[PDB]
């Protein structure tokens, strides 16, 4: 009572199993009908391959009856419902038509098996599915195009030989030569030459003897008109594939050229201009061009949360003020983190300016330099956090909200920063968290010994009724 | 009557008018250049030229019975339509197209195709039909290919007529380039004359070559022009097909914009395989089931009034079934529809867990959600499509024992599509309707009280403290003002 | 150079070019020696010398230049000699270079030499970074690819002709004339799918001609696609400018906008395109990193803004925020930057051009001409809504590019800097009290 | 582009004749035939054949006579290599033009296809589905696909104001409240107007619906209608405005910013809407004008009889923490 899942791996393995008989029938049936040496010479081979193809054809009917479908988001495993979904469709008519024998209407001849060509839907489904699964989208795409062109060329080669046989072998210069002649008589020459004739005709090359009869003029004109669309399709598919490979570089190069034009037009200094060009080369070479937020907006909101948690929650938990934090708040802070990139020599923050954000070092090395910018008090590596006190909302301390130290980027660094508003927005839902986070900041300033505990109580937040209660002493 | 140009009747007439124009463009040049075709089937041309002239005349009748949009409303006035049409340059071309050459007909010949060459001027009516077909067809790329193939044949058919006309002027059988002598066993027939001439131009214009070399200046100059046309015509074929192919590939890319970029990023950021598998299986679900993701971005294509109508027609039926929105105005419910945003959950995903902050109300468009236990194995109840949960959380009703946290765990069985209304989004909408807030809060009281989630005495203590403070603050507002009025 | 930075060292770019030339020589000469059996001794004397020179270039590249390359490690560059050498030694580039110099008279004895293609790719990246309008080099590279394909096709055709027998059939090479030119002629006529060749008679000839024609069809498709991509990338900017101008003119024609206003819009479009190269610069600025955009704004405007007497004593971060909120507006000649009696709500910085403060008994008489770098109208930022009215006409003299900071932008900045807000209010009171 | 091809073809024709002269006329089959022969030796024949040879060789379509000498082989190889670069440049230039002309339709067809996918996905009813399809046909037929705001966003504010004055200032000065408005304010208001297009039978506003916008009819006819849509009280033509009092924040209004009439569009109408917020933003810098606008609206509301209300009714939404702030602020 097994039911196949269309998104599963076993269903895709079946698509390859059914597509091979379907592709074999589209290639070999017309060749055996037109080239009589192929059918008679290898009869014992075709008896095995016809039986194997037939058995897989009937097996596809059973698989179609046991393939589930999503109804209300749940795969349907009821045998009755799976049968009613398939039987009333058009594909059931085409599937049964491919398998019903033509015993009523020579049974060994390939012409009675031409109903097998109606099973083409499994072949196109397999190519559609493989395009998504494959790791190389462009190698598969050029291989898929060649296969379609090769089958059309092979079909036209068999049509030309059948037209030559109907008109007469060697009766004029256009048709295939006399097969009574041993030079043209064997099967290897007549298939390859007709393949050679078909390729030249369908790719707008020509180089073939001109037609003689009026029926021959019509066939070549039709082939030239079809072949001008075949060549346009080949050119269009290769040209469109080329555009896709260079699409990412061309978008980035157009950005660099526009920035370069801005710097010369605006008389940007040579030192600043050379650094910006140098910065852009590092981003492309290290594959840091793409924006994380632009990448992940296509994901669903819940699945984007688990992607962001797997990257930032480990480093955010190591922050001292967030050590006692609830796991619910830590999730919201992770989504609120926004990335920053700096070049060598860039100042993350300077002494005495307003600090409104905390930074976490994803990558790169940061130095706590002095005012000179060359004497390094401390070294900050990946996972380090600075500015943690600044995001905490407390009335101005002895030091205040302003920064204490000059943080400079020694090399290119990636930082993730949590802003003041972002922390304040997130903590509104969690009022207990606000008390805990302020308490660690109260204790951290106690570690540095900036203010007294009762002096910090003026800086700390108070309840609205107690603040009114403190004022209730004043009104009287 | 008066036809509407956007109507089906006017479109059906445009497709009718294609055939007289296509007949005149194709047959008249062939009859002029092939004397065997004109003289051999002279009876059939008298019938078909009368039919084309009749349908050309009926086109001018339809032009006088076609309305136009002035001030956005269709004008059905016969006098105003007629006064508008005769001023147009199309009227001049319509008159010239059917302009009688019958007076000068006999002098050149009893029946001459060149005299009917003025019928070519109705070609703008054919381009209008092709433009109108492209707008409303289901297959815009398949029609563009077929329209290009029609353009290819007409140019090749025209070149074949010019080859036969020049080869007749130079004399048949003079050299290998011109059309062979009719004394040859096959070349006396009219069918061979067209088939050989069409095959000659098909060799050139499709860049095959394989033609006999010319022998004189007229044949040299014809070849130089044909080779240049074959090069410029070939580049038009590649460019049109490469644009069709690029339009096809981009369209499927638009449905699923970024798959490789996410997959590449997850490799660079070393996302764990289990989570990486889930993203890959998510993208497989989109391709197989052809689901859409940027539901909001598609609706930005529509104008704001039409976007609201589309949104209301989809979401108003389920929004009205909410217990707290039962006593709401028609205008208020339509404003709440636009604030709904879609959420999609994979199987086994948790919409909400017990103890989590809840500030949203989820409405189940499709899929099944289960109220699982703390362990998660047993299901208390199953919520199907059209149902909802979390409507108390967006209300902010005083005296609730909920605690602004989720009461029970909700798990998604299968793929579930939900629309959520946040507490903030309801709050901005409610600002325009102050009286509507009070009804929802009152409705919120009843739901909590029936399930015993509101202690009245605990609620009253919150209310009494607030109203005493509100009374005190008004006194405090007096106290600050009474002090400051007498302080100064 | 004690250490070499691959990205910016022109010497390393030149050395990469020489390595590319050596690899190109090996890649061209292996098929020639494989296909063509006999060469004159004078050819041997210079071919062997060039082969030794190319092998010496390979040896110098693997030993000196690649070990002398500094690299970014965790965001920080490494200049240490041992670390640089070890980084090169533990690399796929080193593996490929050693495989290229693998030893393995035989023409295929030098077949490992084709593995120095990573140097070619690096040289391509360096060149497209160094030179503007890289589509010219892309065209040159595609042409070189086509020439090498035809060279390989000629070598294969000579191999086939000599293998079947020279002069055996009409399809194979006769043995008359220069072997390379007659084989290159066949290669061109087949890989371009021109045709016009003797027909293949034997099965081997038919198969060879079929595959050579199919490959030629796809080679022609590749060339057409490359040229189409080059043309699109070249003309994208002009296409965008023309489409924007056409949309604007179509709108103005639909709404019956007068010809004078249409002419002014068209003149602005033409001048802005020809000068700036883009219609709006903010679309470019919001794509850059925040630090890069801030640095560019600082470099353009910080020296001018910091010298403004109104903003002295304010926070440097607040000045930086104003620099980020400055917007660039181009004024047509004789345009009114300020009109007397109009509301003043902006501060203008003259990036380019001149403005004239018209005044006098007659009026419309130049009193002072302000050149580039001037800042005027800064007092209107401190005023309350409706507080400031312009007191004189300021008229642009020629095409003037101004940087404008709106009062709303300054008010939105000042909420984050209460100290500077209080200082600016105090300065506003002092300006009001001292002038009155 | 065609002229460049002709100059190259003509130049290559002359080089072929010069090469044939250098090698010798008639020495072999590849070069031009003998000049001394009267069949070949005249200027009309030798230029036209060489023009034919150059076109036949560069375009790589037809078959040129085979070369005989190694010097001749090199020239034909050079022409074929040059003709490949010319032909690939031709297809790239023409192919890029065709993409540019089709780009407007191609991006419009993607919008319809994206919307058409949404309606079948969300099971939009056929009455509403055909309404959307009919709307997109109106946009393409009358060429209204591109948004006005996106068209003029690159223009400077001075040029944008100059365009907007010529479109809306005549109709905006006909509004009763904006009768005596200052010239500076009127430029601010016409920049705030947003285009709106309504299908036939669409309701601009309904009785009892909250109204925060004022509409000016650029084109089209609107009808004031009863609860049953067919019966119409009055007709609003192009240049008329309604909802002017909704954007004014009068202190006391019996209306309560709710529409008192049903307005319906007889056909497609282009409306420009001035919102309540946009009027507030415009009059921040014109405080005296704001007072005159409210007084004029108050006078109009007196004539209707819908002015006097909320004498003792006031709404207070200050937070308990924010109201506590003033008590702290007053003490310092
Ligand atoms: Ca050919
Ligand atoms: Ca060809």
UniProtKB/Swiss-Prot annotation, chain A:
What's the source species for this entry? Homo sapiens (Human)
A single GO BP term for this record reads: calcium ion transport
Coarsely, its chief localization is: membrane
Residues noted as binding 3',5'-cyclic AMP in the record, renumbered to the chain: 403-404
Under which name does UniProt file this protein? Cyclic nucleotide-gated channel alpha-2
**Portion of the parent chain present:** 130 to 609 of 664
Molecular function (GO) terms for this protein are: calcium channel activity; calmodulin binding; cAMP binding; cGMP binding; intracellularly cAMP-activated cation channel activity; intracellularly cGMP-activated cation channel activity; protein-containing complex binding
Taken from the record's topology, the Extracellular segments are 38-47, 109-113, 164-186
Q: Where are the transmembrane segments?
A: 16-37, 48-68, 94-108, 114-132, 140-163, 187-221, 222-246
Assembly notes: The olfactory cyclic nucleotide-gated channel is an heterotetramer composed of CNGA2, CNGA4 and CNGB1b subunits with 2:1:1 stoichiometry.
The annotated region (C-linker) lies at 247-323
**Where is the segment annotated Ion conduction pathway?**
137-245
Taxonomic lineage from the root: Eukaryota, Metazoa, Chordata, Craniata, Vertebrata
Q: Where does 3',5'-cyclic GMP bind?
A: 387, 390, 403-404
Q: Give the family from UniProt.
A: Belongs to the cyclic nucleotide-gated cation channel (TC 1.A.1.5) family. CNGA2 subfamily.
Q: Where, in residue ranges, is this chain on the Cytoplasmic side?
A: 69-93, 133-139, 247-476
Sorted keywords for this record are: Calcium, Calcium channel, Calcium transport, Calmodulin-binding, cAMP, cAMP-binding, Cell membrane, Cell projection, cGMP, cGMP-binding, Coiled coil, Ion channel, Ion transport, Ligand-gated ion channel, Membrane, Nucleotide-binding, Olfaction, Sensory transduction, Transmembrane, Transmembrane helix, Transport
Instruction: Write down the position(s) of the site called Central gate.
Output: 231, 235
From Swiss-Prot, chain B:
Q: Where is this region: C-linker?
A: 250-326
Question: What reactions does this protein catalyze?
Answer: Ca(2+)(in) = Ca(2+)(out); Na(+)(in) = Na(+)(out); K(+)(in) = K(+)(out); NH4(+)(in) = NH4(+)(out)
Site annotation (Central gate) points to 234
Keywords, ordered alphabetically: Calcium, Calcium channel, Calcium transport, cAMP, cAMP-binding, Cell membrane, Cell projection, cGMP, cGMP-binding, Coiled coil, Ion channel, Ion transport, Ligand-gated ion channel, Membrane, Nucleotide-binding, Olfaction, Sensory transduction, Transmembrane, Transmembrane helix, Transport
Name the positions where 3',5'-cyclic GMP binds: 390, 393, 406-407
What Gene Ontology terms describe where this protein resides (cellular component)?
ciliary membrane; Golgi-associated vesicle membrane; intracellular cyclic nucleotide activated cation channel complex; non-motile cilium membrane; plasma membrane
Superkingdom, natural source: Eukaryota
Bilayer topology reads: Multi-pass membrane protein
Q: Where is this region: Cyclic nucleotide-binding domain?
A: 330-450
User: Which annotated residues bind 3',5'-cyclic AMP?
Assistant: 406-407
Q: What's written under domain?
A: The C-terminal coiled-coil domain mediates trimerization of CNGA subunits.
Give the protein's function. Answer: Pore-forming subunit of the olfactory cyclic nucleotide-gated channel. Operates in the cilia of olfactory sensory neurons where chemical stimulation of the odorant is converted to an electrical signal. Mediates odorant-induced cAMP-dependent Ca(2+) influx triggering neuron depolarization. The rise of intracellular Ca(2+) levels potentiates the olfactory response by activating Ca(2+)-dependent Cl(-) channels, but it also serves as a negative feedback signal to desensitize the channel for rapid adaptation to odorants.
Range covered out of full length: 25 to 512 of 575
Curated annotation (Swiss-Prot), chain C:
Stretches of the chain found on the membrane's Cytoplasmic side: 66-80, 122-133
The UniProt annotation places 3',5'-cyclic AMP binding at: 390
- Annotated site residues (Central gate) in this chain: 220, 224
Region annotated Cyclic nucleotide-binding domain, chain positions: 316-432
Annotated site residue numbers, Occludes the pore below the central gate: 228
For the region Ion conduction pathway, give the residue spans.
Answer: 134-233
Identify the residues that bind 3',5'-cyclic GMP.
Answer: 377-378, 380, 390-391
Subcellular location per the Swiss-Prot or TrEMBL entry? Cell membrane; Cell projection, Cilium membrane
Q: Which domain of life is it from?
A: Eukaryota
So where does this one cross the membrane?
13-34, 44-65, 81-100, 109-121, 134-156, 180-206, 207-232
Residue ranges for the region (C-linker) are: 236-312
- Which of the residues are on side Extracellular? 35-43, 157-179
| Variant or mutagenesis effect after changing residue 334 to I | In RP45; likely pathogenic
Q: What is the effect of changing residue 110 to C?
A: In RP45; likely pathogenic
User: What is said about its interaction partners and assembly?
Assistant: The rod cyclic nucleotide-gated channel is a heterotetramer composed of CNGA1 and CNGB1 subunits with 3:1 stoichiometry. CNGA1:CNGB1 channel binds Ca(2+)-bound CALM1 via CaM1 and CaM2 regions of the CNGB1 subunit; this interaction modulates the affinity of the channel for cNMPs in response to intracellular Ca(2+) levels. The olfactory cyclic nucleotide-gated channel is a heterotetramer composed of CNGA2, CNGA4 and CNGB1 subunits with 2:1:1 stoichiometry.
> Domain remarks in the entry?
The cyclic nucleotide-binding domain (CNBD) comprises three helices and a beta-roll of eight beta-strands from CNGA1 and CNGB1 subunits. Upon cNMP binding transmits the conformational changes to the C-linker domain of the S6 helix to open the ion conduction pathway. The ion conduction pathway consists of S5, S6 and pore helices from CNGA1 and CNGB1 subunits. It contains a central hydrophobic gate that opens upon cNMP binding. CNGB1 displays an additional charged arginine gate below the central gate to regulate ion permeation.
Q: Which organism is it from?
A: Homo sapiens
Curated annotation (Swiss-Prot), chain D:
**Which residue ranges does the record annotate as region Cyclic nucleotide-binding domain?**
183-303
Membrane-crossing residues? 1-19, 43-77, 78-102
Bilayer topology: Multi-pass membrane protein
Gene Ontology molecular function: any one = intracellularly cGMP-activated cation channel activity
The entry's free-text remark on domains says: The C-terminal coiled-coil domain mediates trimerization of CNGA subunits.
Q: Which residues of the full protein are shown?
A: 278 to 609 of 664
- Any S-S bridges, and between which cysteines? none
Kindly provide the name given to this protein in its UniProt entry: Cyclic nucleotide-gated channel alpha-2
Described purpose of this protein according to its UniProt entry: Pore-forming subunit of the olfactory cyclic nucleotide-gated channel. Operates in the cilia of olfactory sensory neurons where chemical stimulation of the odorant is converted to an electrical signal. Mediates odorant-induced cAMP-dependent Ca(2+) influx triggering neuron depolarization. The rise of intracellular Ca(2+) levels potentiates the olfactory response by activating Ca(2+)-dependent Cl(-) channels, but it also serves as a negative feedback signal to desensitize the channel for rapid adaptation to odorants.
